[PDB]
Amino acid sequence: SLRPKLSEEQQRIIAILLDAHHKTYDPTYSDFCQFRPPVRVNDGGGSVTLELSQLSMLPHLADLVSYSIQKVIGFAKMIPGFRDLTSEDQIVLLKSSAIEVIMLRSNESFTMDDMSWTCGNQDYKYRVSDVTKAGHSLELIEPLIKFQVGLKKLNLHEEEHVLLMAICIVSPDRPGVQDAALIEAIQDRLSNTLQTYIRCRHPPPGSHLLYAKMIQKLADLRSLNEEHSKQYRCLSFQPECSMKLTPLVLEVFG
Ligand SMILES: C=C1/C(=C\C=C2/CCC[C@]3(C)[C@@H]([C@H](C)CCCC(C)(C)O)CC[C@@H]23)C[C@@H](O)[C@H](C)[C@@H]1O
């Protein structure tokens, strides 16, 4: 019923997050040519043996993800309150949410036209098959695609998109956090901003119920995170795999 207006601070928080995102997410994907080149071997049969022997798309996707983790670190440092946390808690939050924020931010390149992440010409269009060529299986990929479509359908305003990523990163329920109280205080400030924004800026149908759907996406990410971790583990058993990854990727998922 009640629709309180966004406070001055809440307006500032949103402005800061929008700016942070615009500075860390290049909608033209102009840096991609700097990554090791994508290579797509003939694997129409989806052979795990072949996929693992070649890992043809791993160097490229590993670079794409490493590059993205760097952008996410930059985004997080601009989240109001994040710097108030200890560097130790900052690193714990970053490492545990990295893959989740990547999945969330990737929704901007994802398209329902053909269910792919389109980041330019054909070379930088990623499909389910490109992900299997990087050593992952459908157990992760299919739920990931479902998640992307579910997120697209929420038709989030950019304001809601950046707030969701911030809330995802500043979660008090991450293993190893020391000052959960502070982290939760910061998250609540963000969650209240989102709840308030939805109530007085998001037109129906969806003026309500949207918050719950967004929180549910965060739960969905936890599942995807666990499945990715399990699969990364398997991938790391492949001899010479480390050279196809990056130091940052090795640390974050190691
Ligand atoms: C990164 C991005 C991105 C797309 C994301 C994709 C497509 C290719 C596969 C990938 C990277 C999956 C894949 C399951 C993760 C595999 C990583 C390793 C190999 C380390 O286990 C997670 C998100 C998805 C492009 C831009 O949106 C932005 C630049 C974003 O940030």
From Swiss-Prot:
The disease this record links to the protein is: Rickets vitamin D-dependent 2A: A disorder of vitamin D metabolism resulting in severe rickets, hypocalcemia and secondary hyperparathyroidism. Most patients have total alopecia in addition to rickets.
Could you give the subunit structure recorded for this chain?
A: Homodimer in the absence of bound vitamin D3. Heterodimer with RXRA after vitamin D3 binding. Interacts with MED1, NCOA1, NCOA2, NCOA3 and NCOA6 coactivators, leading to a strong increase of transcription of target genes. Interacts with the corepressor NCOR1. Interacts with SNW1. Interacts with IRX4, the interaction does not affect its transactivation activity. Interacts with CRY1. Interacts with CRY2 in a ligand-dependent manner.
- Outline the segment boundaries, as ranges, of region: Interaction with coactivator LXXLL motif: 77-95
Q: Which domain of life is it from?
A: Eukaryota
Q: From the Swiss-Prot or TrEMBL record, state where the protein is found.
A: Nucleus; Cytoplasm
Q: Which UniProt keywords apply?
A: Cytoplasm, Disease variant, DNA-binding, Metal-binding, Nucleus, Receptor, Transcription, Transcription regulation, Ubl conjugation, Zinc, Zinc-finger
> What PTMs does it carry?
Ubiquitinated by UBR5, leading to its degradation: UBR5 specifically recognizes and binds ligand-bound VDR when it is not associated with coactivators (NCOAs). In presence of NCOAs, the UBR5-degron is not accessible, preventing its ubiquitination and degradation.
* 9aaTAD (motif): residue ranges: 247-254
Q: Name one GO biological process term.
A: intracellular calcium ion homeostasis
What is this protein's name?
Answer: Vitamin D3 receptor
Instruction: Outline the extent of the NR LBD domain.
Output: 9-254
Per the record, the similarity remark reads: Belongs to the nuclear hormone receptor family. NR1 subfamily.
Query: How the protein is affected by changing residue 136 to Q?
Result: In VDDR2A; loss of calcitriol receptor activity; no effect on interaction with RXRA; changed interaction with NCOR1; loss of interaction with NCOA1; no effect on sequence-specific DNA-binding
User: Is Thylakoid found in the keyword set?
Assistant: no
Q: Can you list the GO cellular component terms from the UniProt entry?
A: chromatin; cytosol; nucleoplasm; nucleus; receptor complex; RNA polymerase II transcription regulator complex
Q: Where does calcitriol bind?
A: 25, 68, 105, 109, 136, 228
What this chain does, per the entry, is described as: Nuclear receptor for calcitriol, the active form of vitamin D3 which mediates the action of this vitamin on cells. Enters the nucleus upon vitamin D3 binding where it forms heterodimers with the retinoid X receptor/RXR. The VDR-RXR heterodimers bind to specific response elements on DNA and activate the transcription of vitamin D3-responsive target genes. Plays a central role in calcium homeostasis. Also functions as a receptor for the secondary bile acid lithocholic acid (LCA) and its metabolites.
Could you give a GO molecular-function term held by this entry? RNA polymerase II cis-regulatory region sequence-specific DNA binding
